[PDB]
PDB file of C-alpha atoms (C1' of nucleotides) in Angstrom:
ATOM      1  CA  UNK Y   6       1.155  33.771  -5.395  1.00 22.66           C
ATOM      2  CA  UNK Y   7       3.736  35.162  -7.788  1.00 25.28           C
ATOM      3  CA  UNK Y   8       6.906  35.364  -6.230  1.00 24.14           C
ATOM      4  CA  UNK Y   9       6.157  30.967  -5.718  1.00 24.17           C
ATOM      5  CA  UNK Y  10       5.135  29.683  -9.380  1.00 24.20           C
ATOM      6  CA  UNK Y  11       7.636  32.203 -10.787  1.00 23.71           C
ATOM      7  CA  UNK Y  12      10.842  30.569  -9.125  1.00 25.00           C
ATOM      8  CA  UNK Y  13       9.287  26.934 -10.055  1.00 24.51           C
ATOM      9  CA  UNK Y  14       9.371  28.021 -13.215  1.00 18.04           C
ATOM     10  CA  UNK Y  15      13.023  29.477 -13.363  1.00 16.51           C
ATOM     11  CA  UNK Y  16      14.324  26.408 -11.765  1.00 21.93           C
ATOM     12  CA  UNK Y  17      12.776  23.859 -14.085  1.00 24.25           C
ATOM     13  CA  UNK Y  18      14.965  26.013 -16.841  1.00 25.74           C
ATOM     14  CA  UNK Y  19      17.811  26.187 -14.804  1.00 27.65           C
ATOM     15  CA  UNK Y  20      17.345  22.054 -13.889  1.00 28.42           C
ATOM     16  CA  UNK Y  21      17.114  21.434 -17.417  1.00 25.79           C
ATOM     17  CA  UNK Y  22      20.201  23.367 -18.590  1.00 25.78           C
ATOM     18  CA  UNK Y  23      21.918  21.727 -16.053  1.00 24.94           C
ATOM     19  CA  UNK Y  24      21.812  18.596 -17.397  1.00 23.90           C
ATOM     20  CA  UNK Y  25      19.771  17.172 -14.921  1.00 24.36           C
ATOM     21  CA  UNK Y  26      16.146  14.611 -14.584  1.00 25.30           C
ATOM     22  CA  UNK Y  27      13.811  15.578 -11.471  1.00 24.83           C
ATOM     23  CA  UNK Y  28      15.179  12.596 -10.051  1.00 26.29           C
ATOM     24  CA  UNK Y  29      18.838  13.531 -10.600  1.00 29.94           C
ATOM     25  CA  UNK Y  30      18.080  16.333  -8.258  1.00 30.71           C
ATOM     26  CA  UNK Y  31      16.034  14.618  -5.639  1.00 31.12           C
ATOM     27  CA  UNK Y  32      19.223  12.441  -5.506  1.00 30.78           C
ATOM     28  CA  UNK Y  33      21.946  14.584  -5.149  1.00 31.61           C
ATOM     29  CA  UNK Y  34      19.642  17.243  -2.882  1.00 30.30           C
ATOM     30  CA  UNK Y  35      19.816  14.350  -0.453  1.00 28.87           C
ATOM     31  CA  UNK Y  36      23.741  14.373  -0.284  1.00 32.93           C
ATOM     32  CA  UNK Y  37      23.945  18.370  -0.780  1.00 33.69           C
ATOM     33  CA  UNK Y  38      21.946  18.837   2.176  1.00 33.83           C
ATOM     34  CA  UNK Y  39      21.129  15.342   3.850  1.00 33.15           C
ATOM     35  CA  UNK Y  40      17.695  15.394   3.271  1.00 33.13           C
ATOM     36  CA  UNK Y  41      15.573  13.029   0.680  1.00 37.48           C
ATOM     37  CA  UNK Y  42      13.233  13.690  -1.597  1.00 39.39           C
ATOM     38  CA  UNK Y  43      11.823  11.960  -4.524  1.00 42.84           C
ATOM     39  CA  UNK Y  44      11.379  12.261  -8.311  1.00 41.16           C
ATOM     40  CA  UNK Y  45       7.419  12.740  -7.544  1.00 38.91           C
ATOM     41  CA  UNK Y  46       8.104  15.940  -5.053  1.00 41.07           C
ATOM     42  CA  UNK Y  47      10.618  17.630  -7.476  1.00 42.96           C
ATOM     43  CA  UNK Y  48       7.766  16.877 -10.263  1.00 41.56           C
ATOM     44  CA  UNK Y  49       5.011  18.189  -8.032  1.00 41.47           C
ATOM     45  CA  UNK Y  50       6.906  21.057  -7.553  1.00 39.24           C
ATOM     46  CA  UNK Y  51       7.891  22.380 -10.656  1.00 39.49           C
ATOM     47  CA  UNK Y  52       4.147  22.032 -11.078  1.00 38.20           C
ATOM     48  CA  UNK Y  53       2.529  23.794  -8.273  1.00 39.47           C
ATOM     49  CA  UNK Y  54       0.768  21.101  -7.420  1.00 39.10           C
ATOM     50  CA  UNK Y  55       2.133  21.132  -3.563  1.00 40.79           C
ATOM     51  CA  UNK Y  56      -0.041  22.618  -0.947  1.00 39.78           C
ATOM     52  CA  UNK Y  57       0.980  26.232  -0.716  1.00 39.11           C
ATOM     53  CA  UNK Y  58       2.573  25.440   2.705  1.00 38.12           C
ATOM     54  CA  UNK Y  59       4.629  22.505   1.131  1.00 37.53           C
ATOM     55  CA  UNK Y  60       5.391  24.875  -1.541  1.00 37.52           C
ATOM     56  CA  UNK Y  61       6.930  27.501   0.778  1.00 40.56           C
ATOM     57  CA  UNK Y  62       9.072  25.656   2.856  1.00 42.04           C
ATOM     58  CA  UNK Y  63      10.384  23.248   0.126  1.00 42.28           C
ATOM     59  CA  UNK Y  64      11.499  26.471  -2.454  1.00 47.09           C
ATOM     60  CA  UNK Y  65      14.240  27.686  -0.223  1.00 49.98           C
ATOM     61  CA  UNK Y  66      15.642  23.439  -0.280  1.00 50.33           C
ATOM     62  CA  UNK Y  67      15.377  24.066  -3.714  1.00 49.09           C
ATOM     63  CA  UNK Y  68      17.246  27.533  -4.277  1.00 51.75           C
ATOM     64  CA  UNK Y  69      19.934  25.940  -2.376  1.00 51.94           C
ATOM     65  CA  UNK Y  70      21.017  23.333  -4.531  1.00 53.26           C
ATOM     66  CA  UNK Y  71      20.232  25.426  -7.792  1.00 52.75           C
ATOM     67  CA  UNK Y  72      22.938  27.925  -6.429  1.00 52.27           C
ATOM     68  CA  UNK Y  73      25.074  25.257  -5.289  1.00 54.93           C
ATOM     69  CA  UNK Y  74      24.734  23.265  -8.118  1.00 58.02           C
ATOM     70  CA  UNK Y  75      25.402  26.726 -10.325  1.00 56.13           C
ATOM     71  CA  UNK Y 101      11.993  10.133   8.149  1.00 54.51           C
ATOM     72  CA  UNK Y 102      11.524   6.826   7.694  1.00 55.62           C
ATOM     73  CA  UNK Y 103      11.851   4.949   4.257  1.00 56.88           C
ATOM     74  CA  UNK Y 104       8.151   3.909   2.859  1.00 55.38           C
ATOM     75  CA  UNK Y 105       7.268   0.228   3.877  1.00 57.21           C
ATOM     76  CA  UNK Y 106       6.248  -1.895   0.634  1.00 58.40           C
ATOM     77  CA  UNK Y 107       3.548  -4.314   1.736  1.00 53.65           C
ATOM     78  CA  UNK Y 108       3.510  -7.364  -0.103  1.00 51.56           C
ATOM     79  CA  UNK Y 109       0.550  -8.529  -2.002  1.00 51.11           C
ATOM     80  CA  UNK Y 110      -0.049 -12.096   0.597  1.00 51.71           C
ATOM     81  CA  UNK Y 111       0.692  -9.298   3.713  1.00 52.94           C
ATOM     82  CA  UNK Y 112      -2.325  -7.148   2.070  1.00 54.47           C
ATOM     83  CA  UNK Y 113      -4.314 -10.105   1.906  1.00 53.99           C
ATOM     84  CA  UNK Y 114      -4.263 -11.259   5.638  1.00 52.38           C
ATOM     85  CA  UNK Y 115      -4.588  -7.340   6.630  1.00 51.08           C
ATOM     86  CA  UNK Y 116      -7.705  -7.102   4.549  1.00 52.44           C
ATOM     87  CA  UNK Y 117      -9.507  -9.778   6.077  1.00 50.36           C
ATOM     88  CA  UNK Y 118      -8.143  -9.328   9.296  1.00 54.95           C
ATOM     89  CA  UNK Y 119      -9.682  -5.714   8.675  1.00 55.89           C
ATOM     90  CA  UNK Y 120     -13.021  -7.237   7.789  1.00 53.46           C
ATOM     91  CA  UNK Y 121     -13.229  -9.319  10.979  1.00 49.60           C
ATOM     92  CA  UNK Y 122     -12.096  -5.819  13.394  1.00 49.14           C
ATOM     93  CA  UNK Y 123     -11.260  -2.542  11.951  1.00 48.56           C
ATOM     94  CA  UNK Y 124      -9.864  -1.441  15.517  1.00 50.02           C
ATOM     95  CA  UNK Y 125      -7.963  -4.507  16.684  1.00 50.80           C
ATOM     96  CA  UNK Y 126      -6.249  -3.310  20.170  1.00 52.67           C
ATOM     97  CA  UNK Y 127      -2.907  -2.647  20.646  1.00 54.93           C
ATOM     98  CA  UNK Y 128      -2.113  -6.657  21.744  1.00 58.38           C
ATOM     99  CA  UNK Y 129      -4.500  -8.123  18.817  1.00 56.99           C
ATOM    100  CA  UNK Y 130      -2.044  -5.692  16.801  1.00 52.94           C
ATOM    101  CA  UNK Y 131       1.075  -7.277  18.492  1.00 50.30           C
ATOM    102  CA  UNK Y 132      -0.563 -10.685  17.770  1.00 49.69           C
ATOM    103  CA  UNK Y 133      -1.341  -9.903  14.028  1.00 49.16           C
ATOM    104  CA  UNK Y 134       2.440  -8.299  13.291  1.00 49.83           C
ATOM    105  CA  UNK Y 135       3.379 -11.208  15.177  1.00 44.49           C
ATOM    106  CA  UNK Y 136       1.461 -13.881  12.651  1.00 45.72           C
ATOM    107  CA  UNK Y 137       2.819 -11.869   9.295  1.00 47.00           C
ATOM    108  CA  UNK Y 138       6.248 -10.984  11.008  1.00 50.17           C
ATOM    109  CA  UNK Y 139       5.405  -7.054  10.603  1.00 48.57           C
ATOM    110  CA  UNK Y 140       6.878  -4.604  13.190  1.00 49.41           C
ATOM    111  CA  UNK Y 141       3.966  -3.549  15.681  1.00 50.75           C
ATOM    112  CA  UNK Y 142       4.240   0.267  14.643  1.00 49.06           C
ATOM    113  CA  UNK Y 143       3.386  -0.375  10.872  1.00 51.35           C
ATOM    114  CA  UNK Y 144       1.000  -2.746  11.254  1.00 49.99           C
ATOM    115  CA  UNK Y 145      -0.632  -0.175  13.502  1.00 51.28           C
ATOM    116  CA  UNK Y 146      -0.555   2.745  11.253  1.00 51.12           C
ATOM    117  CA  UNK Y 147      -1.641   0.248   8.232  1.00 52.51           C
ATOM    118  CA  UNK Y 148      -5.088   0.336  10.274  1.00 53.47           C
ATOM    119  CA  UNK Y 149      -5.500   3.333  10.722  1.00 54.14           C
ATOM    120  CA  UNK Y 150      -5.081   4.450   7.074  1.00 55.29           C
ATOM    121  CA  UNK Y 151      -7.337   1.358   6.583  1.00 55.68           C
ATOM    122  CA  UNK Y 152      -9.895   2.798   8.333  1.00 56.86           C
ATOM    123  CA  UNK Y 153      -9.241   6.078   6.944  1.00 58.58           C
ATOM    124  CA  UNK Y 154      -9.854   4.847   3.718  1.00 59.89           C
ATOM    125  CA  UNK Y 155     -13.087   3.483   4.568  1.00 62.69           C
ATOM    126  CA  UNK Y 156     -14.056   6.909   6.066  1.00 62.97           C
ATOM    127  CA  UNK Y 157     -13.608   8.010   1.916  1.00 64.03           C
ATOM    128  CA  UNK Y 158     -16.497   7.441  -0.740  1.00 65.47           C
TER     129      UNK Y 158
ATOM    130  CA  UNK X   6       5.864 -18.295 -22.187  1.00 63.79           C
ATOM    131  CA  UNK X   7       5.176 -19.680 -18.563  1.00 60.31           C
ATOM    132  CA  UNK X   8       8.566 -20.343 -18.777  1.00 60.93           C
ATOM    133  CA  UNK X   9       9.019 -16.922 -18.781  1.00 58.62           C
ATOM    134  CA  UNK X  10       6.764 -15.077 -16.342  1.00 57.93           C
ATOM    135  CA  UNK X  11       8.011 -17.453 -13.536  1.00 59.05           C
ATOM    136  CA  UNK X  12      10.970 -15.355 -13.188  1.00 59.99           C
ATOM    137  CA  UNK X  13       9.081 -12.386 -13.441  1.00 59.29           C
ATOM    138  CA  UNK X  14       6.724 -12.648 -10.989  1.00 58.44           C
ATOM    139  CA  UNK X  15       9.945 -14.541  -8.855  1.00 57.45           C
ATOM    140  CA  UNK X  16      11.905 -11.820  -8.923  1.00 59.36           C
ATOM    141  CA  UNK X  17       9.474  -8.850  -8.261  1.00 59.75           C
ATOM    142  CA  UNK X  18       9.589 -11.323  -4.890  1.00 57.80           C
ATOM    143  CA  UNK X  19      13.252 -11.665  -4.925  1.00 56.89           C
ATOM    144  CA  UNK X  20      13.780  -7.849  -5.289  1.00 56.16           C
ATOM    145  CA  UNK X  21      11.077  -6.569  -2.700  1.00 58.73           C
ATOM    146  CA  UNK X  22      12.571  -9.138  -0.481  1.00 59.88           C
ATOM    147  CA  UNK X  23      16.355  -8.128  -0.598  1.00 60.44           C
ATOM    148  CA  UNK X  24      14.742  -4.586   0.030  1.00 59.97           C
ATOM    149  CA  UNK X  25      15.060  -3.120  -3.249  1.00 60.19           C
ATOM    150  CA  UNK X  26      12.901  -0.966  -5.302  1.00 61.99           C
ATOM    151  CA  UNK X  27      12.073  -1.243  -9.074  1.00 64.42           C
ATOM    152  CA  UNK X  28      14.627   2.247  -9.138  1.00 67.89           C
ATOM    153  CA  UNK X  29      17.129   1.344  -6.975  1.00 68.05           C
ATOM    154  CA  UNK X  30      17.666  -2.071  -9.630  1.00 69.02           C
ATOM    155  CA  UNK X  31      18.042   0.369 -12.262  1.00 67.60           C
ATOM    156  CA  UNK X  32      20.722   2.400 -10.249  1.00 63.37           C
ATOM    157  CA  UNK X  33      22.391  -0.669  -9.613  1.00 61.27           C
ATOM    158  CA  UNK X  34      22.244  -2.181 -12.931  1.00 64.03           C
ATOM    159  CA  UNK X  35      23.748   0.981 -14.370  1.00 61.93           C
ATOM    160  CA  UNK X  36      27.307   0.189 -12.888  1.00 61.09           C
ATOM    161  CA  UNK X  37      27.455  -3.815 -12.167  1.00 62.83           C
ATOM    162  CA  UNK X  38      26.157  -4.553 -15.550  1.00 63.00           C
ATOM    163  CA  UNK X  39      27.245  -1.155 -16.670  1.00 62.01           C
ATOM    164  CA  UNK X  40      24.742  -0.639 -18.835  1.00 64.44           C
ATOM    165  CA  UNK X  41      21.154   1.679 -19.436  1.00 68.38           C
ATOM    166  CA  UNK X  42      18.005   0.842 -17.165  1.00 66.88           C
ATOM    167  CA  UNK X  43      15.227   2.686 -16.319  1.00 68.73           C
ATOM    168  CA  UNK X  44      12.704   2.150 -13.320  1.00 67.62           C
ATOM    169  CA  UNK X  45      10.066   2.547 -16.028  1.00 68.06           C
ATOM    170  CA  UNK X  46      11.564  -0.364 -17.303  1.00 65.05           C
ATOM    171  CA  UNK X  47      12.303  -3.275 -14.425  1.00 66.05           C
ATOM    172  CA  UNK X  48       8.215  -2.015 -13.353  1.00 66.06           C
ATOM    173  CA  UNK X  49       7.767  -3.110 -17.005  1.00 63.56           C
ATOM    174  CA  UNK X  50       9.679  -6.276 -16.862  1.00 62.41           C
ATOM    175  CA  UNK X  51       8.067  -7.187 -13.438  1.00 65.83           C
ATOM    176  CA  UNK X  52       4.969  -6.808 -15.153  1.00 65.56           C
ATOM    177  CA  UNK X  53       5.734  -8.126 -18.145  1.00 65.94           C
ATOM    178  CA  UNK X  54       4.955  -5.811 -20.561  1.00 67.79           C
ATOM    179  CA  UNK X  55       7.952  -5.996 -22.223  1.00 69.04           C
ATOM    180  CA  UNK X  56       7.022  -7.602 -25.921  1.00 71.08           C
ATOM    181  CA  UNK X  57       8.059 -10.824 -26.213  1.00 74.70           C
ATOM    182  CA  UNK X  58      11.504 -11.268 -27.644  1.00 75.14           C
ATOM    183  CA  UNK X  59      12.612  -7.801 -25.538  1.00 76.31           C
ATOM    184  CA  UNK X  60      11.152  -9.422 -22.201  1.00 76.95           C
ATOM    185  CA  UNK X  61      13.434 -12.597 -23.329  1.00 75.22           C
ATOM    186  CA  UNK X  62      16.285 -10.557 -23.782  1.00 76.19           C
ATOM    187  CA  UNK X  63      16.346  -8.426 -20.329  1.00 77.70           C
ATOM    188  CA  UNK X  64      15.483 -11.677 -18.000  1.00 75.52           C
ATOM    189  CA  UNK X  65      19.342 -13.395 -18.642  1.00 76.65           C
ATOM    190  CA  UNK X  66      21.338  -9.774 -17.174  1.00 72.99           C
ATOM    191  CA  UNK X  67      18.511  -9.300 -14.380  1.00 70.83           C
ATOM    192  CA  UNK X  68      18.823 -13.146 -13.161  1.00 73.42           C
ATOM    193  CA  UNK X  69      22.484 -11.920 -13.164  1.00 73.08           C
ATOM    194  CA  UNK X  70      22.061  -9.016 -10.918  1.00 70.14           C
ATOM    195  CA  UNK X  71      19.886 -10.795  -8.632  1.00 70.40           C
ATOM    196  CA  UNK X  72      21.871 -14.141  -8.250  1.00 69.77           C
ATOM    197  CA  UNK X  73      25.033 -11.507  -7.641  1.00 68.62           C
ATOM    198  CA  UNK X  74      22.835  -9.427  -4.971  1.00 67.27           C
ATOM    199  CA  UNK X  75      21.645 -12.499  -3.233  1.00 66.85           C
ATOM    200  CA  UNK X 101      22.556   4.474 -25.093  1.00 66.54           C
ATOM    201  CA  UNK X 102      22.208   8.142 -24.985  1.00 61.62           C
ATOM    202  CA  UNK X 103      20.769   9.749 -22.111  1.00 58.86           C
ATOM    203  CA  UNK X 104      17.362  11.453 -22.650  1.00 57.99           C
ATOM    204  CA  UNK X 105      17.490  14.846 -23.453  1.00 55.75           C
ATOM    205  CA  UNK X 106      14.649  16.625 -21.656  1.00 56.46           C
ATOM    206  CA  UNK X 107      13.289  20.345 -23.500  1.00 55.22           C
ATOM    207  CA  UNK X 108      12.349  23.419 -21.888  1.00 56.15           C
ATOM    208  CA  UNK X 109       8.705  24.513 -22.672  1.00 51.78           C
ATOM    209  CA  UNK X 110      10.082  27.246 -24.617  1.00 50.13           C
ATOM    210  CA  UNK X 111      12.814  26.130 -26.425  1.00 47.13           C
ATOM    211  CA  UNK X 112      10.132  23.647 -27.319  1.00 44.36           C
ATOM    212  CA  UNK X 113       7.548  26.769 -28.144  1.00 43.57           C
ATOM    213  CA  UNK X 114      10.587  27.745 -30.707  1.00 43.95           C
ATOM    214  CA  UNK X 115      11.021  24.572 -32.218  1.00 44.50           C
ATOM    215  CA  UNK X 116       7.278  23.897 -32.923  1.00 46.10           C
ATOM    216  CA  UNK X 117       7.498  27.842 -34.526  1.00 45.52           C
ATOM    217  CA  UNK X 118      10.339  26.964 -36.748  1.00 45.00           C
ATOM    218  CA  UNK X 119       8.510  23.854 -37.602  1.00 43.09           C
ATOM    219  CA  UNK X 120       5.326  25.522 -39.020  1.00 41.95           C
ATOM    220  CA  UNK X 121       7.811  27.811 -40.848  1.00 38.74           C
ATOM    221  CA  UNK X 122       9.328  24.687 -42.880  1.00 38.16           C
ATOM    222  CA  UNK X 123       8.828  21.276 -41.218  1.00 39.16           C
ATOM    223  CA  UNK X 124      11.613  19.543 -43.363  1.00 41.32           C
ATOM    224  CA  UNK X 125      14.309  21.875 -42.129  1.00 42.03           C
ATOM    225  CA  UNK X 126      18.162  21.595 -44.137  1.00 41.76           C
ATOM    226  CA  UNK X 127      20.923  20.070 -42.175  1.00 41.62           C
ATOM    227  CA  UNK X 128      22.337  23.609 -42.267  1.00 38.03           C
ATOM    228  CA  UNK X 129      19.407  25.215 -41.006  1.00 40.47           C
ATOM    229  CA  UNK X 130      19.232  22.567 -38.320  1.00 43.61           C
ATOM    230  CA  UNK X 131      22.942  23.149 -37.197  1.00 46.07           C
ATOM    231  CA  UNK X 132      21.391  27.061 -37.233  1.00 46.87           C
ATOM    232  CA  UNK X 133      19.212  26.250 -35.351  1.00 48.17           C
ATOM    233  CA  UNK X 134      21.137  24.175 -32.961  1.00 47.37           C
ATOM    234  CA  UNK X 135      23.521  26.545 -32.167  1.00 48.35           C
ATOM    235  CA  UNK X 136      20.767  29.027 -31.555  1.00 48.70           C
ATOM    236  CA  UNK X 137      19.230  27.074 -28.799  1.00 51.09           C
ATOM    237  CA  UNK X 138      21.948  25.788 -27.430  1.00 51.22           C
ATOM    238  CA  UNK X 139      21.037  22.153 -28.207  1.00 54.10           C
ATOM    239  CA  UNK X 140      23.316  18.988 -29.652  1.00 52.61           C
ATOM    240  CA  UNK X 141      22.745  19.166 -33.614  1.00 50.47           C
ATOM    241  CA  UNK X 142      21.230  15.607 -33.624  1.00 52.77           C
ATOM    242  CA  UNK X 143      18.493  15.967 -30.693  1.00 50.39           C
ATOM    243  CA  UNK X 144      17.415  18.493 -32.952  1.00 49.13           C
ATOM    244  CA  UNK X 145      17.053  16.419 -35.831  1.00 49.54           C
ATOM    245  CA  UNK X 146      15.320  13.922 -33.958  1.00 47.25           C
ATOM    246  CA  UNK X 147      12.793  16.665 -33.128  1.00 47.14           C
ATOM    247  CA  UNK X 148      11.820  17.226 -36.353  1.00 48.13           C
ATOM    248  CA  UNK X 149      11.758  13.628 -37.748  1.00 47.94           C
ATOM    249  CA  UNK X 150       9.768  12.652 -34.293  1.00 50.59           C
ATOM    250  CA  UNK X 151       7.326  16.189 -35.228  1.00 49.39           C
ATOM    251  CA  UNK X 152       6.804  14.633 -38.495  1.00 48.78           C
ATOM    252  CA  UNK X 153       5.752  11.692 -37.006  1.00 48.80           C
ATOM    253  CA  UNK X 154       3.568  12.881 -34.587  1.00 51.36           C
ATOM    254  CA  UNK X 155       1.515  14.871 -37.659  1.00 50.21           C
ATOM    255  CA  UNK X 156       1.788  11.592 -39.545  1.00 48.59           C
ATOM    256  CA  UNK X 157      -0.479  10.268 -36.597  1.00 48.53           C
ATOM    257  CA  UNK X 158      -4.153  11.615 -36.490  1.00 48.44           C
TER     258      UNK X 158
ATOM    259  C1'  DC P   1      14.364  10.245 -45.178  1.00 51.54           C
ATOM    260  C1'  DA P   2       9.907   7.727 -43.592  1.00 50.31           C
ATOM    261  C1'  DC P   3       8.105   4.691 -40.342  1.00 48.91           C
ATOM    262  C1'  DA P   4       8.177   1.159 -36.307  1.00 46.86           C
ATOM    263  C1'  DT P   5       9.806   0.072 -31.998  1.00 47.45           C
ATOM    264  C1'  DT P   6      12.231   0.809 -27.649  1.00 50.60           C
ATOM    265  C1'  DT P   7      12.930   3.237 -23.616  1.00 47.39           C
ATOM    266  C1'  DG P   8      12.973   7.022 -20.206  1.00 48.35           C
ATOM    267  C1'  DA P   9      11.706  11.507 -18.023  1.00 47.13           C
ATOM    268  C1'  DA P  10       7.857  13.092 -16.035  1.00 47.37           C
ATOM    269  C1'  DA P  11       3.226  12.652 -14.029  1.00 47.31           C
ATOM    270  C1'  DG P  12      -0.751  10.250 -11.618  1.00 44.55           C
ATOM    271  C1'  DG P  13      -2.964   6.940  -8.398  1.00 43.33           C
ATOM    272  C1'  DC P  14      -2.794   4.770  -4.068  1.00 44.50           C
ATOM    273  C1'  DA P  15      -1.080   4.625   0.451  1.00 39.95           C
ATOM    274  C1'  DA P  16       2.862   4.719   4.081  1.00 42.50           C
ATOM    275  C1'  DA P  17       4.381   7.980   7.264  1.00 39.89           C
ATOM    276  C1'  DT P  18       3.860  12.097  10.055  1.00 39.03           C
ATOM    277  C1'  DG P  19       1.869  15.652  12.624  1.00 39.97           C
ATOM    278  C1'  DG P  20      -2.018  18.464  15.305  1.00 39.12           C
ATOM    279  C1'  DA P  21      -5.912  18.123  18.392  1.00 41.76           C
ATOM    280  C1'  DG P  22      -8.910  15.376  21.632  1.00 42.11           C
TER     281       DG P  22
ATOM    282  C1'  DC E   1      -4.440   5.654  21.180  1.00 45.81           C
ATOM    283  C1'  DT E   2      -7.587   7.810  18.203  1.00 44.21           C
ATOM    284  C1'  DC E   3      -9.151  10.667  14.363  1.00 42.68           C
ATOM    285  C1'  DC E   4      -8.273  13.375  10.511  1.00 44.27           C
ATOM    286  C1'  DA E   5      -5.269  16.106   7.530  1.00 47.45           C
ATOM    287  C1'  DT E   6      -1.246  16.353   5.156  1.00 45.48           C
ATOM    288  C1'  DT E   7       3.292  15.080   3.513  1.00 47.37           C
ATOM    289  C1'  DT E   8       5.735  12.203   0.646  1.00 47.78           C
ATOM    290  C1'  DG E   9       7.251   8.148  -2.513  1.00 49.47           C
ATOM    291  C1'  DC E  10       6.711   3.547  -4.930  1.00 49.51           C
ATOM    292  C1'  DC E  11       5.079   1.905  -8.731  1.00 47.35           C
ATOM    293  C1'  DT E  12       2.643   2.747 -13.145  1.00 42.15           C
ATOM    294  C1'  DT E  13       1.712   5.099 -17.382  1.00 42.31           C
ATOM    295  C1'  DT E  14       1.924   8.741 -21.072  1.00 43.31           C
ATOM    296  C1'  DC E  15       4.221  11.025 -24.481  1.00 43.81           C
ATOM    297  C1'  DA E  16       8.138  11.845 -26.891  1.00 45.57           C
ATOM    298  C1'  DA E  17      13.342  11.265 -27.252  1.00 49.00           C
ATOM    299  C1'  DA E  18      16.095   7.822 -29.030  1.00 48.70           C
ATOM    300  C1'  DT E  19      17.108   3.635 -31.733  1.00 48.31           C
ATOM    301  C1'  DG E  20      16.332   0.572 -35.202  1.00 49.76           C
ATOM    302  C1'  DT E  21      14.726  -0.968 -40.195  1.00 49.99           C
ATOM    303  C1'  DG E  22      13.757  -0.460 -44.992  1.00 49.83           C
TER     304       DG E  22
END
DNA sequence: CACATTTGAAAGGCAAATGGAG
DNA sequence: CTCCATTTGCCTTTCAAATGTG
């Protein structure tokens, strides 16, 4: 609605005059309120292209730190890790929980990623 | 080179490995080596699509940073002050340094930016 | 100045993490 | 756990802001 993509248009302005980069913000908004967000979600937001939901409950972060102003880190999987985890995907897209202590195990991965790398695995497969 | 690449490709492993990403090098870099570098940049050296003598140049200052761990800012422009300048510039494209320090003050913009704008606008019609 | 190159802010693709329901 | 949807960011890439050369 209005009263949404209005106000992420007034704070891109705002941003701007200030002196600061969509990542500047992200950065400080972090410190200024504890959170964490990054230069993509300040971007997406400015833009409207957040779910309206996302939209919603991130603007009042945002009016926050304009005034003002006025969850666990992503894992990077290394190229070799993707490797074993695709073929190790093409033997058994649903190892069990041990074959998924064995195979964090073998690439020194904690069990918890290497169980949610799976499941987006398969997810992805579910997508065509 | 080979010679080259092999500390590319190293230190992409290097980097990932001390748990560092392409962005938080160029945070870092911007107060050990106190000087200018841009995520957009260390994913470019990484991936070596730096030109040549450039790519030679960076390597020596990033080998620094990593053996240690183991410029004017961009001026961004609102939409509409940009919607004013691209007016003006159909008006007279080749704008006197007067008129530009007009123009400058109107917008509330450093005198040279503007400049910039123009000679970069000429450029960009120069290109079709 | 014109023109060529460098370099970064912002945006886009792919996926890591999270959250609701069974 | 899973599945499936959704949030969120790392890395890449575009366009132009800035620097460099003649």
């Amino acid at each position: 609605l209005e009263e949404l993509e209005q106000f992420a248009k007034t704070f891109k302005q705002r941003r701007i005059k200030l002196g600061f980069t969509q990542g500047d913000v992200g950065l400080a908004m972090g410190k200024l309120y504890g959170n964490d967000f990054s230069q993509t979600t300040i971007s997406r937001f400015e833009a409207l292209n957040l779910s309206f939901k996302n939209m919603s409950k991130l603007k009042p972060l945002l009016e926050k730190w304009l005034n003002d102003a006025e969850r666990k880190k992503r894992t990077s999987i290394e190229t070799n890790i993707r490797v074993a985890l695709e073929k190790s995907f093409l033997e058994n897209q649903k190892p069990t929980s041990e074959e998924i202590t064995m195979i964090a195990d073998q690439l020194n991965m904690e069990k918890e990623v290497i169980r949610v790398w799976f499941s987006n695995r398969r997810q992805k497969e579910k997508r065509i």
